[PDB]
Amino acid sequence: MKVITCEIAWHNKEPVYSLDFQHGTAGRIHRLASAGVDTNVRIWKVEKGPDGKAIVEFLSNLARHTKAVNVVRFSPTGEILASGGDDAVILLWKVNDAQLNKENWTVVKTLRGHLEDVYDICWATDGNLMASASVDNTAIIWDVSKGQKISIFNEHKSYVQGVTWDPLGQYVATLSCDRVLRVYSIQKKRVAFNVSKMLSGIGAEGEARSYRMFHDDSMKSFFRRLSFTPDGSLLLTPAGCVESGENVMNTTYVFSRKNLKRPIAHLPCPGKATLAVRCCPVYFELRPVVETGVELMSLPYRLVFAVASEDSVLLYDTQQSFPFGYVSNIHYHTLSDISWSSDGAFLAISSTDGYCSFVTFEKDELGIPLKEKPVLNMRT
Amino acid sequence: MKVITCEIAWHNKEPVYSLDFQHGTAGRIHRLASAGVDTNVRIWKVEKGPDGKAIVEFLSNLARHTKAVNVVRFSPTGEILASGGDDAVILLWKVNDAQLNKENWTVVKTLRGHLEDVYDICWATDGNLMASASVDNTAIIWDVSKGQKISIFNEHKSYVQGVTWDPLGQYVATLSCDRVLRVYSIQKKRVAFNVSKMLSGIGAEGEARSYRMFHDDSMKSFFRRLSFTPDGSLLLTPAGCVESGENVMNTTYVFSRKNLKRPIAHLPCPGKATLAVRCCPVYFELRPVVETGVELMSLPYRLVFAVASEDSVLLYDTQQSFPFGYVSNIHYHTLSDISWSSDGAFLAISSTDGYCSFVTFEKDELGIPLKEKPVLNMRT
Amino acid sequence: AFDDAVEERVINEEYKIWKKNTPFLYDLVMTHALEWPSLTAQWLPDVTRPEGKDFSIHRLVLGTHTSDEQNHLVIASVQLPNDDAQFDASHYDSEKGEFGGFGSVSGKIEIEIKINHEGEVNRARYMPQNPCIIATKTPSSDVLVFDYTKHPSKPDPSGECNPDLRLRGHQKEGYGLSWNPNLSGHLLSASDDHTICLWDISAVPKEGKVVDAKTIFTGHTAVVEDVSWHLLHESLFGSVADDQKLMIWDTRSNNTSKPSHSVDAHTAEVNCLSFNPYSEFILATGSADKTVALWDLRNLKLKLHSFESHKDEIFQVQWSPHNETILASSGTDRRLNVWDLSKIGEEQSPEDAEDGPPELLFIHGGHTAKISDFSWNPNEPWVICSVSEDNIMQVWQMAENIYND
Amino acid sequence: AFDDAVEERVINEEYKIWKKNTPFLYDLVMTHALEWPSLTAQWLPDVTRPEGKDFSIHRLVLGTHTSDEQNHLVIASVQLPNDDAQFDASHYDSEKGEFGGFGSVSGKIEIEIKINHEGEVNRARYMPQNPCIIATKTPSSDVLVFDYTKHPSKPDPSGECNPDLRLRGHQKEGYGLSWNPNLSGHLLSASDDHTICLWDISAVPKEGKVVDAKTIFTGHTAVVEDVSWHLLHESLFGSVADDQKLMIWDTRSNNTSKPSHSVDAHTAEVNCLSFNPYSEFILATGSADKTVALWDLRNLKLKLHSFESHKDEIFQVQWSPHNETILASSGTDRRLNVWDLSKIGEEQSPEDAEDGPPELLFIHGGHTAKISDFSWNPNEPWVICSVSEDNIMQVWQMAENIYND
Amino acid sequence: GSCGKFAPFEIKEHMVLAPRRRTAFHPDLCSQLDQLLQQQSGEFSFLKDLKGRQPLRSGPTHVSTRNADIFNSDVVIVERGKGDGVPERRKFGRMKLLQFCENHRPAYWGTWNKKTALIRARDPWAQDTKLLDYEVDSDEEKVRQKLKAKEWDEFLAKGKRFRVLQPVKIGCVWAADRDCAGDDLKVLQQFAACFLE
Amino acid sequence: GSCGKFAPFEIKEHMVLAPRRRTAFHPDLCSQLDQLLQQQSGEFSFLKDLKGRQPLRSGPTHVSTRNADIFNSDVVIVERGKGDGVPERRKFGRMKLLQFCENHRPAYWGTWNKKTALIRARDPWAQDTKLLDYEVDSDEEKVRQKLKAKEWDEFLAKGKRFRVLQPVKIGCVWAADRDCAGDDLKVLQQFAACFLE
């Protein structure tokens, strides 16, 4: 793997808050979207050079936002670009057929109904439903085609700093600043699971030592972007605390579908707190297996994902216990968002110091992709 | 000669308005001072590397100024640093024996009495008298040792954008926005010469065709920094217009001491208007002379100087008619100030785009320095 | 007589038509004419990837076959374009309708190290634990061991070589040579003396220069054509001889005259063998029957399969390091056959069966003479270097649409 | 006898003490031992300044003097540190109290081009209008002309040279050679045949290889030791011969047997001459009198001055290209004398007059044999390269405090 | 890793070594093999299991050294101009390199999208007439600016009308210089002083 | 500039040629010289006029080509730490290079500030004892950071406490890898997943 840190600021040295690749791409060159405090959403063209170093070409600028843009997400088809910011309005952009633009984008839908800054956005698999988290303690589910809100979750007690949508279309997961993870049933439109506390073994005096899983306000990152596995089997939630010794340690919790009230495991991240989780959309054939019960889940394939903390990125897969990659000390301030490319050859990382970076992989470096992507057991 | 354009902004990409080397240096390494709109006066250490490319080392920052700093000038001994800005107060800095500073500077005198922005400052040869030009239509002469104003010239009708002091201590030259050059007698403390109009040949029917020498408000530069020759023989005034044919041409006028009401000549600069003139303090032995009346002045030595227009720098000497150097298209916006080094090996150019550049000369490239610097026939 | 002229004409026409059809079948073709014919060819594990460059540099160990000149062990460099550089929209030929143009981009093949060598280099194989150590088989009874870092980049002004180690176990020349991938310093050689010699050079002093044979196996009754260590077991090794026999020997067995297992592999001389890198039970043996036999170590009585598309004797069989189901075999028929194991026993259309058995995947007929030796590139998949008798070396790779599809 | 041993001992002691005193007198000393002695040495006008490097690369044209081996015309490269790099606060030796340390910074001297040459290279001089063209004097009656860009960087496997031009005007060997700096292609040569030959190679066809003499001057009655064109006049040229005579010839004069001016320059053989680059009237002639005579072309009857600090015969006199008042002279006394014109006739302290006349500025005694030829560097001031008989080449520069002060 | 009298292999700055093994290390494996070596039971069929699973493969050798490849990019690419409107490069596949020692014509480096149904990998010598004439081939032989940070800022300030500056510097040209180029002399004469009397 | 059958001299990319003339071209000069060549008047004394004026000199050869040397600097030097407090370099003069072919000891590259009154340029062999022992010398043998634009901005934000980041990247390390370095394996094991039941 190679690490290319960009020495030129994308948003006039203002913090970059979000990144996302165009998932609809099926070739070798990719489209990337970045949001910043400069009230601009910039779309760039990313491709590898002859040597293998990533090269970024500027494509377009979207300045309709009046305040800082915090989250940018592409639809599963890569056709609609969702941008949310401090103006509490979500803009849906599409390609249409203004001096600085190589290609032009225009707003199609203005999703309104939030009262404060929007921090995270997640699409549904079909692309006709969307979910957004905001500072106003509410997570709103929107009908994309109608461009109107369809449900509001106000059970949160603080800022909602992360929302993910189940690829099987059964649950919606929200992480809030109140150290509480919430899982809402997509059919009941109510709260299905609450995950706030956690016990750690047996106490010294035979007591039930129970603490809070997630971090307090001391986190330096606005976001707690958890994520579902592309197959949907596992749920990865950053910003977790484990009382290993007399002091707590930062970790990312890993939950199963079989039981969502207790995680299978936790990936520890000593040092700073984990804030983002993003999975590679490529299903890989299993590595030559040394037979052990080490795998997080036992399925014929494996999936690579990345966990971004304040100052590092850890690259894990499904079957190994230890991460196969670790990058750190490439940005002078807290990281904001990570995004994989469609082919898995790029991992874009954004940080609040104003500069972004890329992690590139050679052909079949992560693994051998499956011949056919496994079919999903959708709930609907 | 070599040109080294700095790719890193000295004043947070804000415009740089002035530059001046420490004239008191007698070695190979020099001290440079830069003023900007960021309300900071930055002192750097400049020296040539092993290859010959200029290298800039940051030394100190002076943030006592509240508004943009427009002019920075070093005393002839290089011991007192004069800084003037939009706050109408001139700070005199000295080295005394604030986290970012390698060396510390503190204000000694706060010269007050101006009502608007200060644009130009000139020291006297003895270093005990100073002259400053300001937006308030007044040029003020200060007693440096007493730290108080000693004289005010209010004969100007617009902004005063340049003041120079006679090395022989007889005259003070001011260039104002009213297209008028003024020469004040240093002893009478009154106006000695007015140079505004100029005739060009005979008309078509004998009429006395007379136009205005200097540029109108269309000038893109705040400054009209004229300069005296280090020996004092000649006076160079930029921002001049000559009606050669039916159209005007930008030029820098060259006047003699014998008569100050008519220039000897004009150096034409087609394109943009000239704004700054700065002379090299090194007296050079005459080049192998092809016998012609080409020399501006006939003396055993010669002097190299530079004229900076909005987008170019022309390098002249005394005896040649055509400039021996020309540099252009190194900055994206108007140049502000130029300054020679003590040994003549450096020429620092500042521009309003936020970046500065250096013109370096190899050993004895400009000429052969005189064994002994000629003594000046001061008037006083 | 007319035989030589007719053969030359037919071979020239076949090479011309193969060159004309090469764009449809290959993604990389690099034909280079060496100074002298090479009897051996092996890819070195080194790949240097200079940062900021669009190519990688691989290395090859080769020999020279001079009738009456000075023979050399050669280490050469080959430049291969990087995968990221294989997609480039440099120029668009509006006539041919391709992103082509001959341009100036070309593969750079050059000789890096030449070392003197008394006699022909029958086969040169580097030690996996140390690529600096290379063992060469001479036309003499001794096996030579060189360290190319201890020799000048240019050969000596005159005279024969000064080998770092000389191993004297045989009585005649040989061609089979293999290092132990699990025990550093253990070398096996096979020769016409009907014996296999095992040396252990892991205890040689600094000033030592001659090593005697540690063990001699005399089970074979004919010329032992090839010997090869097992890729996962530090004790088992296979050998194929001219007596139509393949023998599996255990170094822990005290009987040096009877192998642990014996198999009547073929009906004529068996010239080569190679173990599959991904399966510890599967190996392949190429014979003079124009056949390649697949053998399972768990069932040695039954031949797993017989690849039968060659037209003459087979001298080298090597597995692909990047795919367990891919095999390769070369021989005197000037052809290099690549076979897929996963296509054995599959139904075939009547016209497809005309070309050959379903297990046959690819045919390389770019050689105008007997293919002396070929080797898979362990770093770049599907890249094979083959050297033939007419001092021709070809580093090639078949088209992606042939194996990927 | 004892003379050789005593001379060798004294010269070795003198070289040792000179090496010990070298830091006080030089800012640059580069002693290099060549493969063979060089009878000629000339600085090429090329100076390559690689960006991002602390040095420049100059080039030198040299010859070889082999008794019975193959002779070569050599073009060599010398690395000299840049002026900006001469001030460097890298290390501070707390013991010796200097910013010194031997370190790893050193001058790189290497041979770039070697061309075959039949016979010794008596003197090689490049054409100023084209540094690619170099004229060489052989021990034969012909003068050779080479273009080093038309010859291989390495010499031919065997055989003599292949000169680009052969000029046949003389009957014996010679040493004086000079191009015309105002007329391209005009070459003057002097030999023991008592004549001076002028060639014009500016009209040679592409396939031409032999050029006959355009003009022959026969004024001298002895061996014409040296000839040199005037630096500003395309018609006048000076010559010094063994008949104690210096003659100024005009090519416009139809009399090829009588010079335009004749001067009884010295009391013995005059071996060299050179015109001042800054004054068209002043020239200098070095004689066997151990003297250098200064001549004004406006008054030839009176000798302007006589420099008299040499201890033996003088063979080369060259002016400094960067200072009109600086002159240099070398000879068989193993010394290179540098003189200041502006110090002629100055009062001198009693102990200073012991060293020599006031016009004498510097003495270079780092050569243990006769200085065959020296040359000023036209790009770096005060840098002189001198080659002696004992295959020793020295590129040096005296201390700054000696001339600047 | 020194074997005998030979020094261990020295890995260069940008060298990569192909893996020595292609399978994970199983501890009991060899032992089990020994059992399967002595039982000689033909109950196991490897070819039968081959078609029931995916073939074991491995990828090209990549760099895995600690802190090996870390780079910085100071350039943003800005493309201006419609150009020729060439088709999509992605749909043209890999660029093939075909070079031959005996060919006077230089090496071929380009794509090949011609389609046939007769030139098979099973038969390299299979002729395909009416599409390829089998004759000897060798008979005879808009803007994409790479802006730096400062240039990117200027482009953002101006837009598509912005162009990178081309610095124009003229060296020291003197009246006494004789070998100085005449073009620079005339360009500097364009600024010649004009006197008044 | 082609002379005869020889091509004109080709100036390389970074080549400089020493000037062919050292004086400005005077048109009538030669003619006057011709007159002065035949008049032979001893009225002119060059040595007398030499002491009445400055010697004619010229400087080292410099580059004068159009657009020859134009460079960009993206680095600002920031010096931190008192260091050893070494004396001023300027007062130590030029660094002398003294190298000898016969010396086993490497070349000397350093200043020389020893002062004598006996080792004169007029007499190289003049000995100066009691200061220099005349024996064979060759007998046997704080932080200055170079910040980029982004690092300079971070330094301005923080101050002297700021230090440049050292990126830490660990390549692809897999459980099946056998030749992978153990240090990276343990560093990655430091992040090993912990399961709960």
Regarding chains D and A, contact by 3 or more CB pairs under 8 A is answered as no
Distance CA A291, CA C302 (A): 31
Residue C40 CA: distances (Å) to CA of C77, C126, C388, D14: 16, 12, 9, 64
Q: Which residue of E has its CA nearest to A12?
A: E153
Domain count, chain A: 1
Q: Residue F154 has which token pair?
A: 């971070």
For C335, half-sphere exposure in the C-beta direction (CA atoms, 13 angstrom radius) is 21
What type of residue is E79? Answer: E
The pairing of beta strand D292-296 with beta strand A105-112: unpaired
Mention every residue, 6+ apart, whose C-beta is less than 8 A from residue B332.
Answer: B351, B353, E150, E154, E165
Distance CA F123, CA D332 (A): 18
Q: Residue F21 has which token pair?
A: 């003339």
- Cα B270 off chain centre by: 21
Give domain status of residue A136, yes or no.
yes
- CB within 8 Å: B50 and D51: no
Mention every residue, 6+ apart, whose C-beta is less than 8 A from residue C404.
Answer: none
Distance CA D132, CA F6 (A): 8
Q: Give B333 to chain D, closest Cα distance, Å.
A: 29
Annotate B46-63 with b (16+ C-beta within 10 A) or e (fewer). bbbebbbbbbbbbbbbbe
What type of residue is C53? Answer: K
Phi and psi at residue D209, to the nearest 5°: -135, -20
What is the dihedral sign for C-alpha C51, C52, C53, C55? positive
**Residue A171: which of A238, A252, A249, A260 has the closest Cα?**
A260
Phi and psi at residue D19, to the nearest 5°: -65, -40
Distance CA A323, CA A321 (A): 7
Q: Is C355 helix (H, G, I), strand (E, B) or coil?
A: helix
DSSP secondary structure, A100-114, as one string: S-SS-EEEEEEEE--
Q: Rounded to 5 degrees, what angle do the CA atoms F45, F51, F53 make? A: 100
Mention every residue, 6+ apart, whose C-beta is less than 8 A from residue D3.
Answer: none
- CB within 8 Å: E84 and C92: yes
Residue E139 CA: distances (Å) to CA of A352, C10, C135, E105, E122: 62, 22, 45, 8, 30
Q: Is C301 helix (H, G, I), strand (E, B) or coil?
A: coil
On whether the CB atoms of residues E76 and A8 are closer than 8 A, the answer is: yes
Chains in touch with B (≥3 Cβ pairs < 8 A): D, E, F
Out of E150, E154, E193, closest to residue B321 by CB: E193
Mention every residue, 6+ apart, whose C-beta is less than 8 A from residue D33.
Answer: D391, D392, D393, F101, F102
On whether the CB atoms of residues A151 and A143 are closer than 8 A, the answer is: no
Distance CA B207, CA D188 (A): 68
The pairing of beta strand C392-398 with beta strand F108-110: unpaired
| Residue B361, domain CATH | 2.130.10.10
Distance CA B33, CA B13 (A): 16
Tally C–E CB contacts below 8 A.
278
**Residue F165: which of A154, C395, C139, A5 has the closest Cα?**
A5
**Helix, strand, coil percentages in chain A from 3-state DSSP, rounded to 5:** 0, 50, 50
Task: Region of D391 please: left (phi>0), alpha (psi -120 to 50) or beta.
Answer: left
Q: Could you count the other beta carbons within 10 Å of the beta carbon of residue C386?
A: 22
- CB within 8 Å: E64 and F24: no
Distance CA D188, CA B8 (A): 58
Q: Residue B174 has which token pair?
A: 């001011």
- CB within 8 Å: F23 and E180: no
Place of tokens 């802190």: E67
On whether the CB atoms of residues C281 and C273 are closer than 8 A, the answer is: no
Give domain status of residue B376, yes or no.
no
Mention every residue, 6+ apart, whose C-beta is less than 8 A from residue D275.
Answer: D228, D230, D231, D238, D282, D283, D319
What type of residue is E11? Answer: I
**Residue C334: which of C286, C260, C386 has the closest Cα?**
C386
On whether the CB atoms of residues D137 and D189 are closer than 8 A, the answer is: yes
Distance CA D384, CA D363 (A): 12
Q: Which residue of C has its CA nearest to A48?
A: C84
Distance CA C237, CA C249 (A): 5
Place of tokens 């240039």: E151
On whether the CB atoms of residues D192 and D137 are closer than 8 A, the answer is: no
On whether the CB atoms of residues D125 and D318 are closer than 8 A, the answer is: no
Q: Give E165 to chain F, closest Cα distance, Å.
A: 13
Give domain status of residue A370, yes or no.
no
Give the single-character DSSP code of D299.
B
Distance CA B282, CA B130 (A): 23
On whether the CB atoms of residues E138 and E105 are closer than 8 A, the answer is: yes
What is the dihedral sign for C-alpha B29, B31, B37, B39? positive
Phi and psi at residue E157, to the nearest 5°: -65, -45
Q: Residue A351 has which token pair?
A: 């940080």
- Give the DSSP H or E segment for A151: strand A148-153
Distance CA C142, CA C173 (A): 8
On whether the CB atoms of residues D61 and D75 are closer than 8 A, the answer is: yes
Residue F2 CA: distances (Å) to CA of C145, C160, D126, D214, F21: 59, 52, 15, 20, 20
Q: Residue F114 has which token pair?
A: 């020893």
What type of residue is D65? Answer: H
SS (H, E, C) E146-193: EECHHHHHHHHHHCCCCCCCCCEEECCCCCCCCCCCHHHHHHHHCCCC
Give the single-character DSSP code of E86.
P
Distance CA D286, CA D298 (A): 20
Mention every residue, 6+ apart, whose C-beta is less than 8 A from residue F173.
Answer: A324, A325, E64, F180, F184, F185, F188
Give the single-character DSSP code of D36.
S
Distance CA B336, CA B161 (A): 12
The last residues before gaps in chain A (C-N over 2.5 Å) are: 97
Q: Is C318 helix (H, G, I), strand (E, B) or coil?
A: strand
Residue A165's domain comprises 2-360
Give the single-character DSSP code of F7.
P
Out of D81, D132, D248, closest to residue F97 by CB: D81
**Residue E164: which of E50, E39, E76 has the closest Cα?**
E76
Q: Residue C107 has which token pair?
A: 């593969």
On whether the CB atoms of residues B62 and B71 are closer than 8 A, the answer is: no
On whether the CB atoms of residues A178 and A156 are closer than 8 A, the answer is: yes
On whether the CB atoms of residues B82 and B74 are closer than 8 A, the answer is: yes
Q: Could you count the other beta carbons within 10 Å of the beta carbon of residue C162?
A: 12
**Residue B76: which of B28, B120, B121, B22 has the closest Cα?**
B22
Distance CA A195, CA A182 (A): 6
Enumerate the residues of chain A whose CB falls inside 8 A of the CB of residue C88.
50
Residue B91 CA: distances (Å) to CA of B121, B124, C92, F124: 11, 17, 65, 57
Give domain status of residue A379, yes or no.
no
Distance CA D189, CA D179 (A): 9
**Residue A362: which of E96, E60, C378 has the closest Cα?**
E60
- Give the DSSP H or E segment for C21: helix C2-25
Q: Is E36 helix (H, G, I), strand (E, B) or coil?
A: helix
B interface residues, F as partner, C-beta within 8 Å: 1-9, 12, 27-29, 45, 53-58, 99-100, 102, 285, 287-290, 330, 361-365, 368, 371
- Cα E112 off chain centre by: 18
On whether the CB atoms of residues A319 and A306 are closer than 8 A, the answer is: no
On whether the CB atoms of residues C20 and C353 are closer than 8 A, the answer is: no
Annotate E123-153 with b (16+ C-beta within 10 A) or e (fewer). bbebebeeebeeeeeeeeeeeebebbbbbbb
- CB within 8 Å: B296 and E193: yes
Distance CA B168, CA C161 (A): 87
Distance CA D75, CA B84 (A): 60
Q: What own/partner pairs with CB < 8 Å and gap ≥ 24 does A328-332 have?
A: A328/F167, A328/F168, A328/F169, A329/F165, A329/F166, A329/F167, A329/F168, A330/A3, A330/A5, A330/A357, A330/F165, A330/F167, A331/A5, A331/A355, A331/A357, A331/F165, A332/F150, A332/F154, A332/F165
Q: How many helices and strands in chain F, by DSSP H and E?
A: 4, 8
On whether the CB atoms of residues B67 and B78 are closer than 8 A, the answer is: no
On whether the CB atoms of residues D208 and D185 are closer than 8 A, the answer is: no
Out of B3, B254, B324, closest to residue E172 by CB: B324
Place of tokens 């795998």: A295
Give domain status of residue B378, yes or no.
no
- Helix boundaries (H) for chain F: 29-39, 46-50, 149-158, 182-189
Distance CA A284, CA A367 (A): 6
Mention every residue, 6+ apart, whose C-beta is less than 8 A from residue C168.
Answer: C141, C142, C143, C210, C211, C212, C213
Q: Residue C367 has which token pair?
A: 């050689």
Phi and psi at residue B175, to the nearest 5°: -115, 125
Q: Is A314 helix (H, G, I), strand (E, B) or coil?
A: strand
Q: Could you count the other beta carbons within 10 Å of the beta carbon of residue E28?
A: 8
DSSP secondary structure, D150-198, as one string: GS-SSPPSSS----SEEEE--SS-EEEEEE-SSSTTEEEEEETTS-EEE
Distance CA C310, CA C376 (A): 19
DSSP secondary structure, C253-299, as one string: -S-SSS-SEEE---SS-EEEEEE-SS-SSEEEEEETTS-EEEEETTB
Mention every residue, 6+ apart, whose C-beta is less than 8 A from residue D200.
Answer: D183, D185, D186, D187, D214
Q: Is C149 helix (H, G, I), strand (E, B) or coil?
A: helix
Q: Residue D103 has which token pair?
A: 């370190």
Q: Looking at the DSSP assignment, which residues form a beta bridge with residue A302?
A: A284
Enumerate the residues of chain C whose CB falls inside 8 A of the CB of residue E131.
none
Residue C146 CA: distances (Å) to CA of C36, C134, C163, F84, F183: 20, 5, 5, 52, 33
Place of tokens 């790779």: C397
SS (H, E, C) C74-111: EEEEEEEECCHHHCCCCCCECCCCECCCCCCCCCCEEE
Enumerate the residues of chain C whose CB falls inside 8 A of the CB of residue A48.
84
For E32, half-sphere exposure in the C-beta direction (CA atoms, 13 angstrom radius) is 7
- Give the DSSP H or E segment for D215: strand D215-217
Give domain status of residue A9, yes or no.
yes
Q: Residue A206 has which token pair?
A: 């035979």
SS (H, E, C) C365-395: CCCCCCEEEEEECCCCCCEEEEEECCCEEEE
Enumerate the residues of chain C whose CB falls inside 8 A of the CB of residue E99.
29-31, 106-107
Annotate D229-264 with b (16+ C-beta within 10 A) or e (fewer). bbbbbebbbbbbbbbbbbbbbbbeeeebeebbbebe
Q: Rounded to 5 degrees, what angle do the CA atoms E157, E158, E159 make? A: 110
**Residue C374: which of C18, C42, C37 has the closest Cα?**
C42
Every domain of chain D and the residues it spans: 1-405
Distance CA B234, CA B214 (A): 18
Q: Residue D357 has which token pair?
A: 């006349």
**Residue B267: which of B236, B288, B294, B310 has the closest Cα?**
B236
Place of tokens 């035949």: F38
Give the single-character DSSP code of E91.
G
